Every structure is written in C-alpha cells, then in structure tokens.
RNA sequence: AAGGUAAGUAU
RNA sequence: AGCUUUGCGCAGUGGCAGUAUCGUAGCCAAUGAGGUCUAUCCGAGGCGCGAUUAUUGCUAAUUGAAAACUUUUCCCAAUA
C-alpha cells in the first residue's frame, strides 16, 4: 500500500527542496526550489490525436 | 432484583470502571457518565429510596 | 504535518539507509505511538530505541503537544465566540478538549 | 411574499400574550 | 504524502490506470509541498490501508508530470480523480465540477464513503455516481 | 460428516432427504399434503419408522 | 551521528496493545425497540374517571 | 468410465489415509522419509506438512 | 500488574521455603533457579505487544449470496420482522392533526396506535417474540 | 411547505416570528360538471394572511399562577363537599378546570397516580439527568407525568390550518390532486416504507446507510413538487425530462 | 459568474 | 441373578439458545489459571491471534447475469 524506504526518502527530500519555510537556510516562496524543450501534451480531443502523436514522434532525437 | 440490590448495598464496595464523554454545549463541556446497567439499577433504587 | 515531515526527513537523512531503508516506515510508526502515548497519558518507553532517536522523538512530541494544546484552546475560544465552524472541526476540538 | 421570517421587535406588540389562548 | 506510491511520468500513470481491473484507482494530482495537497495526502494515507481491498491510491506531481494538465484541467492546487477499468468516473458532488475532487477533505470517513460509492457505481457499470454527501455547502454553522 | 459430504458430492450416495416429523410435515411436504394428505402422512410416518427402524436395528445388532 | 549501524538495526517494530475485540470488533447489530415500549407509551394518557378521596394539590360486552 | 474409477480410487486413498497411524515424533518421521526415499523437506514445508506428506506416501505405498 | 506478581512470588517463595525447611540447596541453586524464572515471567508480562496487521474494510458486495433458512432463520425473522403494533406505529392519519404526546420529543408520535382510523376495534397486543432479555454471557455473571 | 402540520405532509414548523403568506398562495381551483371554478380564502378585505405566532398561544406565567391558585382552591372546596356527600370527583365536576393549574388537574386523573406519589426529588433528578444522557433536555425543569403538560398547541395548529387556507388551500400546493383520491378523509401516511424500514437493520456500510436516511426527503420533495418546482420560486432556465 | 453536465452502448 | 452408580462412545426423541461456536507446530498454567463478595480463604483454564451468514453444509426459488442487440463507414457544410 505504502511506498518503500527509498521512495519515502526521495519524496521527503523532494518535499524539503521546495518547502524552504521548514527546511534549508534561505527562505524563498512556498513552491520555489531556489535557496529549450517544452513537452507536447494531448488536449484530450479526438481531432488532435494525429498532430499530437506526430509531434511526440518528431521530438525523438 | 431487590435481594441483589440489598446484597450490593451491604457487601459491594468495589465497582467496575465507568465511561466518560463530554456533552459539547459550545460554551463549555458537561461531563456525561456511563455506568454499568447492573450497578445502574442499584444506584437508581438507592436514589429513589 | 510540517513537523512530522521535518522530523522524518531529519531522521532519514542521518540514517545510514544504504542498508536500513526498511526501517523508515517503522520510524514514522514510533512517531505515531509516542504521540498516541502522550495523547493517551500513558507511559512511553521503547527499550530498544537509541537515546538520540528517543530524544528527537520526545522533542517532536513536545512541539506537537504545544501546538495541539494551543490549537485546541484557540478553536474552543473561536467556537465560544461564535465563529462559523464545521461539524468535523467541532468533533476534533471536542476530542482535544 | 418572500417567506422570510421577519423579526417582530416592535411588530405585533399591540396584542397581549393571552390572546388566542383558552 | 511521502508514504503513498508516486508516479513519475505520464506512462506510469497510464499503466497504473490500466493495471487495476477490480479496484478503483485514486490519483491525487498536485504537489507534495502544497498545503491543500498535504491535507489531502494525509487523509489518503490515513485511509490508504482500509481501502486496500477496493482501491489503490497513487500520487502524481503535475509539475513533474504535466502530461494530463490540458485534458484533465489539473490547474487547481489539489485534485483527486477516480478511474475504474481504464475509465474516468464522475461524482455528483454538488460543486458543479463532477469530474474531480478539487479541495482538501478533513474527515477521513467521507473519503472512504466517496471511494466506496465510486466502486459500487463503477462495478455496476455507471460512469457517474452520486456522492452520499452534497458538497454545495461546507455545512459551517 | 466430511466423508458423507464428499460421498454426496461425487454421487456415491444419493443426496440426503429432509428429515420430516409430524410437526415438520406442513413445512417440507406442505404443498403436496393438500392434494393427497393421507399419502403424505403415510410417507412421513414411513420415514419416521425407518429412522426408528435403523436405531433399533443398530441397538439389536450391537447387543 | 553517534548511532551505529547495529543500533540502527536494533530499532523495534511498533505493535498494537489492544486485542482483537477492540481492533476488529464484530458488527454491532441494531435491533428495534421492544413492542412493550409502544404499549407503555400507549398506557399513558388513559385517565381514571374518578380521583381518590385523599388526592390533593401536591400528592363490558 | 475411467474418470469414475480414478475419482473412486482417490476417495478410497483418502479414506485409508484417514485411518493410517503415523508417529508424531519429527525425528521418527524424518527417519521414515529417509528410509522410503522421498526428500525431508519440499518447498519449505513445515513439520505438519511433512507429516501430511508421509501420510500420503504411506497411503499410496 | 502487581496482584499477579504477588501470586507468582508467593508461589515461588513457598517452593523455596519448602526447599529450605529441609536444609537442601544451601548455596542457593534452587533460589536462583526460581528467581531468574520470576524475572523471566515479569519480562514476559511487560513485553511490548506484537505487530498486528490492520484488517482492511471488506470490498463492497454485489450479486447474490445464498443464505439458508430454517428454525434459526425463522426465529431471527420473527425477532426482526415487522410486528402489528410496530406496523401501526409507522402509519400516520392524513389530515387528522393529533395533539403532541411526548413533551421531551415532539417528533415522537404513536401514529395509528391508540388513535381513531387505524381500523382495529380492539387494542393491538405485544408480540412476545420481541421481548428484551439479557445475553448468554450476562446470564453467566448472574 | 414549512408550517403545514406533519399530518398533511408539511414539516410542522413552529414560528416564533412574523411570516406573511402571499395572497397568490391562497388560491386554488377545482373541476366539476360545470367546468373549472377558482377559489380564494380571504373574503374580508384584510392584509395578506399572517401565520399564527407561537407568541400568542402560550399563557403567561403570572396568569398561569393566578389560574393555578384559583383552580386549586376550587378543587379543595369541591373535594370538601365530595367527602361530605360520600362521593368522588367524577371527571365531570372538574370540567371547567382541566388544563389550568401548575400541577395540571390532568395529573389527578393519571392512571399511574399511585406510583408517582412515591416519586420524590424528581425535579432535581431530571435536572441532574444531563450528566447521564448525552442529549440536552429542553424540558429539564419539569416532568410531564408529575407536573402535567403546561402548554397546548391545539389552537395554534387550528389557526395555522385556517391561515393557510384550510385543507383545500394547503393541498393545492401538493401532488394530492394528482393522486385522484376522491377525498382526504379516509387517508393515512406510511412514515417508513415496507422495504425502507426493513433495511434499518441489515448490516449496511456508513455510506450505504447515510444515503438511505435521505429517502424520506425524496418523498417530501415529491409531496410539495407543484410548489417547490416553480418558475416564480426558482428563477432561471428550465430543462425538461428526456421522456 | 457559478454551486442546474444523467450515465450507457453503436458508428 | 435382577437392580443400580460413574465415565465413555453410538444412536433415538424432545426442548432452549444463535452478541456466538471453533481453531492454537502461539504463549502461559495445579512447581497454581484466575480472584468484586467471605481471603492464614476460593482452584481452572487463561491470554494473544485467526475463521464466520456471530458454527458449517447441501436443497430449491429469485435476481444479476448469460444468450443475444444492424455486434458491418454517421452527421454540419462544399462542388459537379
């Protein structure tokens, strides 16, 4: 049901990397990590299945 | 039942635990006590008498 | 929630988890029982628990208990004043009081 | 016509509370 | 939040929805650091074991997995969504959005009731289930 | 009991018939005891005697 | 940092004190109130046609 | 039909197994299994499973 | 946990006294053989409870499951089935406003029970199969 | 839908307030051989119908005490002459004084008037009942058996039915005319369904039981559907059912 | 501005 | 030689109870289980866990099904 030890530890570190009001030294906003390529995603429409699929194919290097 | 009640009045000095809840009147808490029914009968008869 | 996350993160960071990852969940269970043992007003003394781990768990329990008491009293005063609150909030506050 | 229960502070104060009771 | 299983890419979410054939897949789209998401995730963790027989709970980071943001409108701080046999299940919550639960629920019993109702309706073949509680009002008095 | 149940499962023995007494006659044979009441009574009493017959037979053979 | 690996492994698993009757109690069947309660509520409201000579203000086919 | 014959054979094998006396001593059970050739343990079987296997072997044998 | 400890210690002390009255085991081999098992029993009593798995809620149930019927089922249905007085209880006359019966609860109402229109000339009797009686284990305490 | 007594399908709400009934709600219509005829209720040129207020239908404490003293002196006299004539009060002599005294004259004729004479300290016990039961008692100060019923809502309900236009005016708001019952006389409700009541004890889950406790509402909305489902009360677009 | 989307098979 | 006592199986008849029966290669227990009466006295199983429709089987209805639905390229709009 629950995550293994590695997953729990990794999730805790990822949460700590964002909540700098609890962890860390410097204090950024709640969701900021401080202190190209944009993935193409389907919009859920049957008319745009082909273009989204081809764009996913066209993004392979 | 009366014989059991008199026997409890004479010889019973130890009793089972009674549960406690709190009626929330939203201004304070009123304690509410749940006693065993077998002791409840004796206590009610004693109160009436 | 933030206190539990912070305590667990600290314990798992200092844990040499290269061999003992499976204890991580166990750690949280202790952080529950101790808290429960404080809420139940019963003694809590784990015999196999290392002294630094027990000390930090006690610090976590003390901080959570201070927050718990303050939150319970604040919510009770809100309800007494007439603050508009939910049924689940009322039940939880009644349990805390 | 709204059906909202209106306060009777100052409303229907002319009549006593013994009226319409037997 | 840090105890429930995590899905790290869109393909993993696809497989998680596809894999379960007799249990409702409950997926929380959001962020671990979001306070609303922390409340929702701690409620889910509280009821994670009790609903083992008829539900599986996963957590998806929308920033890490923005694959379903466009179609599922995953733009609220927290979102809980139910799937059954690879089929999104809608809930007549009374909030006007039947496609998802987009708020943190305090009581852990209400979430169990919602999951149970979703399971019953979906196993009966329905695509919409009427929740036992109407959420058009927070019942605050 | 398991021996009997598995014998009945595999068809070795016929499935057990309901045990019917006089007070039980209107619950097991109720619908057929309005059409031929005396035939039903005779069948029920024959079953009762056969149950008694086996008991006395076992007692006599064991004695 | 002073907790050794063997000490870390020596951490015990947390168990539950309460027994089967409290952890997983059997279903609490609800039953209707006995008919005698309807009968007794029905007895009340049946009034004598006469009063005792000593009663005061404070006590067919 | 041979299916009825084999079902009856299995049933009578089980019936005989229900009346075979087998020692409850684990050492004697292991010695008997060694004498009759079958392995002491099969897929992590317990002592009760070992007793059942010895009973089945003695029933077939 | 002190009455049980007192009983165990008294029994072991009686054993040790019976040993000593004959001046056997002068060094105290029997005394230590009993003291260490007393400590073992004390440790066993104070042992932490073991890990018990949480039982998940049963999956919601759909379909048909065959249930038996018989004397037990008949008795259960008679105890749980609707009674004539409890049948009249949940019937309210339409248009005939009745005076409030119970002061503490205005919701409570007898319905057709004791009120005209029920169609029963004679008063309904109490189904004695719905009698309230103590459990079997409560009989043991008595 | 609120102040209609529960016998007619309403909620039977008691109003300690000022609620006006619009005159448009006091109109009904019936069909006979000559066609359809329309009726109102307020013939007199008065204001809109005002529901009776639980204000006026309670006797004040001072008048209640004066009535109690007068009635109990009267009963003392009547008992004095009753003893002399070797007769007992036959519930007919005590007809002018029936629901008047603080220990209501009702209590003198109560069937269990002998066992209650040995009930002492009942008011203190009733007050202290709050520490044993988990529900607050609004009538913590009095006992119905010992002190009598110190209030009556017969006049209140009568005037509530009169103010709403009677049965004809009330039932025009309901689906009663859709049932085609010839009259309202020989009619009775069934509070719980034959099957709905059987499920109260069948081991249902919390979610399953919670949704089953809303079944009566599904009937209430059906009873007042011609009035709840209206364009005047719910402004906005309308959607017709698919069949 | 909303809290007013029946769902289900079929192309 | 009849009668008769106790324990134990095997049956037959009848009654009562279904908030309970059962399991123990888990632990503990007449070297004392467990103790509110009456304690220089009482004396037997308890505890934990597991199974369940609060013992478990068949038998027969009903429902859900199941068997099927044209399980086969539609529409808004464009031109000839």
* DSSP codes of every residue in F1-63: -HHHHHHHHTTSSPPPPPP--TTTHHHHSTTTTTTSHHHHHHHHHHHHHHHHHHHHHHHHHH-
Q: Evaluate whether residue E81 is within a structural domain.
A: yes
Query: Hey, which residues does B33 pair with through a beta bridge?
Result: B20
Handedness of CA D10, D13, D17, D20 (dihedral sign): negative
Note the CA–C1' distance, H46 to L49, in angstroms.
Answer: 19
Tokens of B9: 């009045």
Between the CA of residue I135 and those of B8, I139, I142, what are the distances in Å?
Answer: 21, 6, 11
Resolution of this model in Å is 3.1
Query: Hey, which residues does I93 pair with through a beta bridge?
Result: J188
For residues J53 and D17, the answer to whether their CB atoms sit within 8 Å is no
Degrees (nearest 5) of the Cα angle I90, I96, I102? 60
Cα–Cα distance, H48 to H40 (Å, whole number): 12
Note the CA–C1' distance, I67 to L55, in angstroms.
Answer: 14
Tokens of I117: 């229109």
Select from C21, C35, C87 the residue whose CB has the most chain E CBs within 10 Å, as the one to mutate to test that interface: C87
Residues within a 7 A CB radius of strand K = E 87, 90, 92, 94-99, 125-128, 136-137; J 234-239, 242
Q: Evaluate whether residue E46 is within a structural domain.
A: yes
The size of the A-C interface in CB pairs under 8 A is 37
Handedness of CA I8, I9, I10, I15 (dihedral sign): positive
**Closest C-alpha to E112, from I58, H10, A37, C73:** I58
- Cβ burial of E111 (10 Å; 0-12, 13-18, 19+) is buried
**Closest C-alpha to J64, from D18, I101, D19:** D18
Note the CA–C1' distance, H11 to L25, in angstroms.
Answer: 28
As a whole number of angstroms, the longest Cα–Cα distance in chain H is 43
The secondary structure element, H or E, covering residue J35 is: strand J35-39
Is E2 at the interface with chain A, CB within 8 A?
yes
Cα–Cα distance, E137 to E133 (Å, whole number): 10
Q: Evaluate whether residue E91 is within a structural domain.
A: yes
CB contact under 8 A, A39 and E71: no
For residues C49 and C30, the answer to whether their CB atoms sit within 8 Å is yes
- Chain E residues touching J207 at Cβ < 8 A: 112-114, 116-117, 132
Cα–Cα distance, G39 to I119 (Å, whole number): 18
Instruction: Tell me which residue has tokens 């029997």.
Output: I30
CB contact under 8 A, C79 and B22: no
Degrees (nearest 5) of the Cα angle J181, J187, J191? 120
Q: Evaluate whether residue E97 is within a structural domain.
A: yes
Mark the nucleotides of strand L covered by protein, meaning any atom under 7 Å from a CB: 9-15, 17-21, 25, 27-28, 31-38, 47-64
3-state secondary structure of G47: strand
The closest CB to that of C25, out of A8, A13, A22, belongs to A8
Tokens of J45: 């040129």
For every residue of E79-132, DSSP letters joined together read EEEEESSS-EEEEE-SSS-TT-B-S----HHHHHHHHHHHHHHHHTT-SEEE-S
For residues B36 and B18, the answer to whether their CB atoms sit within 8 Å is yes
Nucleic chain L contacts, protein chain I, residues 99-138, CB cut-off 7 A:
133, 135-137
Cα–Cα distance, F24 to F44 (Å, whole number): 9
For residues C60 and C48, the answer to whether their CB atoms sit within 8 Å is no
Q: Evaluate whether residue E74 is within a structural domain.
A: yes
Q: Evaluate whether residue E141 is within a structural domain.
A: no
Cα–Cα distance, I55 to E50 (Å, whole number): 7
**Closest C-alpha to J198, from I80, G27, E132:** I80
Beta strand extents in A1-61 (DSSP E only): none
Cα R_g (chain C), whole angstroms: 16
Instruction: Tell me which residue has tokens 């305090």.
Output: E106
Cα–Cα distance, F26 to F33 (Å, whole number): 7
Instruction: Tell me which residue has tokens 């009991």.
Output: F1
For residue D6, what is the DSSP state? B
For residue J96, what is the DSSP state? S
Contacts of J207 by beta carbon, 8 Å cutoff, 6+ apart: E112, E113, E114, E116, E117, E132
Cα–Cα distance, J106 to J113 (Å, whole number): 10
Strand L contact at CB of residue F35, distance < 7 A: no
What is the pairing mode between strands B29-34 and B19-24? antiparallel
Is E124 at the interface with chain A, CB within 8 A?
no
In chain E, the number of structural domains is 1
Nearest C-alpha of chain I: how many angstroms from J229?
23
Q: Which nucleotide is nearest to E94 (CA to C1')?
A: K3
φ, ψ (nearest 5 deg) of residue E106: -75, -60
- Cβ burial of D14 (10 Å; 0-12, 13-18, 19+) is exposed
Query: Hey, which residues does J50 pair with through a beta bridge?
Result: J20
Cα–Cα distance, E135 to E127 (Å, whole number): 19
CB atoms under 10 Å from CB of E18, counted, come to: 12
Cα–Cα distance, G4 to G10 (Å, whole number): 10
- Domain containing residue E125: 2-136
**Closest C-alpha to E94, from E130, E118, E140:** E130
- Cβ burial of J105 (10 Å; 0-12, 13-18, 19+) is buried
**Closest C-alpha to C17, from E32, A7, A1, A22:** A7
Instruction: Tell me which residue has tokens 């309706």.
Output: E121
Q: How far apart are the first and last CA of chain D?
A: 31
Cα–Cα distance, E27 to E10 (Å, whole number): 12
Chain center to CA of D19: 11
For residues G59 and J117, the answer to whether their CB atoms sit within 8 Å is yes
**CATH code of residue E27:** 3.40.30.10
* Residue J8: HSE in the Cβ half-sphere, 13 Å Cα cutoff: 27
Cα–Cα distance, D18 to E35 (Å, whole number): 59
Is J206 at the interface with chain E, CB within 8 A?
yes
For residues E113 and E50, the answer to whether their CB atoms sit within 8 Å is no
């Amino acid at each position: 049901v629950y995550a293994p030890g590695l997953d729990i530890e990794s999730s805790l570190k990822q949460l700590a990397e964002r909540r700098t009001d609890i962890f860390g030294v410097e204090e950024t906003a709640i969701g900021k990590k401080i202190g190209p390529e944009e993935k193409v995603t389907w919009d859920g429409h049957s008319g745009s299945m082909a273009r989204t699929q081809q764009a996913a194919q066209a993004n392979i290097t | 039942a009366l014989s059991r009640i008199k026997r409890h009045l004479l010889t019973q000095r130890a009793f089972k635990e009674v549960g406690i809840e709190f009626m929330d009147l939203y201004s304070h808490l009123v304690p509410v006590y749940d006693v065993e029914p077998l002791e409840k009968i004796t206590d009610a008869y004693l109160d009436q008498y | 929630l933030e206190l539990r996350a912070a305590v667990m993160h600290d314990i798992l960071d200092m844990m040499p988890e290269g061999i003992k990852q499976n204890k991580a969940r166990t750690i949280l269970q202790h952080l529950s029982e101790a808290w429960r043992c404080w809420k139940a007003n019963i003694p809590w003394k784990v015999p196999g628990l290392p002294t630094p781990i027990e000390n930090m768990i006690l610090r976590y329990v003390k901080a959570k208990a201070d927050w718990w008491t303050n939150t319970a009293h604040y919510n009770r005063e809100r309800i007494r004043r007439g603050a508009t609150v939910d049924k689940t909030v009322c039940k939880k506050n009644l349990g805390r009081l | 016509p709204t059906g909202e229960v209106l306060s009777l502070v100052g409303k229907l104060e002319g009549t006593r509370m013994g009226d319409k009771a037997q | 939040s840090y105890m429930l299983p995590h899905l790290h890419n869109g393909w993993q979410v696809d497989q998680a929805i596809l894999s379960e054939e007799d249990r409702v897949v409950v997926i929380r789209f959001g962020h671990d650091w979001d306070p609303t998401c922390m409340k929702m995730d701690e409620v889910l963790y509280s009821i994670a074991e009790k609903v083992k027989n008829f539900a599986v709970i996963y957590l998806v980071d929308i920033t890490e997995v923005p694959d379903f943001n466009k179609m599922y409108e995953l733009y609220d701080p927290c979102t809980v969504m139910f799937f059954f046999r690879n089929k999104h299940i809608m809930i007549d919550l009374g909030t006007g959005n039947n496609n998802k639960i987009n708020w943190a629920m305090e009581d852990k019993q209400e979430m169990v009731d919602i999951i149970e109702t979703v399971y019953r309706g979906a196993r009966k073949g329905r695509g919409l289930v009427v929740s036992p509680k109407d959420y058009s009002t927070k019942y605050r008095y | 009991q398991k021996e009997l149940q598995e014998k009945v499962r595999l068809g070795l023995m016929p499935p057990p018939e309901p045990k019917v007494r006089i007070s039980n006659l209107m619950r097991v044979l109720g619908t057929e005891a309005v059409q031929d009441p005396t035939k039903v009574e005779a069948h029920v009493r024959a079953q009762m005697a056969k149950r008694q017959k086996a008991h006395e037979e076992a007692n006599a053979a064991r004695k | 940092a002073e907790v050794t690996e063997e000490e870390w492994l020596s951490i015990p698993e947390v168990g539950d004190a309460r027994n089967k009757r409290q952890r997983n109690p059997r279903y609490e069947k609800l039953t209707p109130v006995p008919d005698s309660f309807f009968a007794k509520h029905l007895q009340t409201g049946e009034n004598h046609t006469s009063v005792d000579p000593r009663q005061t203000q404070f006590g067919r086919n | 039909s041979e299916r009825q014959a084999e079902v009856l054979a299995e049933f009578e094998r089980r019936k005989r197994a229900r009346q075979i006396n087998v020692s409850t001593d684990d050492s004697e059970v292991k010695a008997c299994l060694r004498a009759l050739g079958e392995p002491i343990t099969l897929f992590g079987e317990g002592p009760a499973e070992r007793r059942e296997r010895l009973r089945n072997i003695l029933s077939v044998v | 946990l002190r009455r049980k400890a007192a009983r165990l210690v008294a029994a072991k002390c009686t054993l040790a006294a019976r040993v000593d009255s004959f001046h056997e085991s002068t060094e105290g081999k029997v005394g230590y053989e009993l003291k260490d098992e007393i400590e073992r029993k004390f440790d066993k009593w104070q042992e932490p409870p073991p890990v018990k798995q949480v039982k998940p809620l049963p999956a919601p149930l759909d379909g048909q499951r065959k249930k038996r019927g018989g004397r037990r089922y008949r008795k259960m249905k008679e105890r749980l089935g609707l009674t004539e007085i409890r049948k009249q209880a949940n019937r309210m006359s339409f248009g005939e406003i009745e005076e409030d019966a119970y002061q503490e609860d205005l919701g409570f109402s007898l319905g057709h029970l004791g009120k005209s229109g029920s169609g029963r000339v004679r008063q309904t009797q109490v189904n004695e199969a719905t009698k309230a009686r103590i459990s079997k284990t409560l009989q043991r305490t008595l | 839908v609120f102040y209609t007594p529960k016998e007619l399908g309403g909620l039977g709400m008691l109003s300690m307030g000022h609620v006006l009934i619009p005159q448009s709600d006091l109109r009904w219509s019936k069909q006979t051989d000559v066609g359809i005829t329309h009726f109102r209720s307020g013939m007199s040129h008065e204001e809109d119908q005002l529901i009776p207020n639980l204000y006026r239908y309670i006797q004040p404490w001072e008048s209640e005490f004066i009535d109690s003293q007068r009635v109990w002196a009267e009963y003392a006299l009547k008992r004095q002459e009753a003893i002399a004539q070797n007769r007992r009060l036959t519930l007919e002599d005590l007809e002018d004084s029936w629901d008047r005294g603080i220990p209501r004259i009702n209590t003198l004729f109560q069937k269990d008037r002998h066992t209650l004479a040995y009930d002492k300290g009942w008011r203190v016990r009733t007050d202290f009942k709050q520490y044993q039961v988990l529900k607050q008692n609004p009538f913590w100060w009095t006992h119905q058996r010992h002190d009598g019923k110190l209030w009556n809502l017969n006049n209140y309900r009568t005037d509530m039915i009169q103010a709403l236009g009677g049965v004809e005016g009330i039932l025009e708001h309901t689906l009663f005319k859709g049932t085609y019952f010839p009259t309202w006389e020989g009619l009775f409700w069934e509070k719980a369904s034959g099957f709905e009541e059987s499920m109260k004890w069948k081991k249902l889950t919390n979610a399953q039981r919670s949704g089953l406790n809303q079944i009566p509402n599904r009937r209430f909305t059906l009873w007042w559907s011609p009035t709840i489902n209206r364009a005047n009360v719910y402004v906005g677009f309308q959607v017709q059912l698919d069949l």
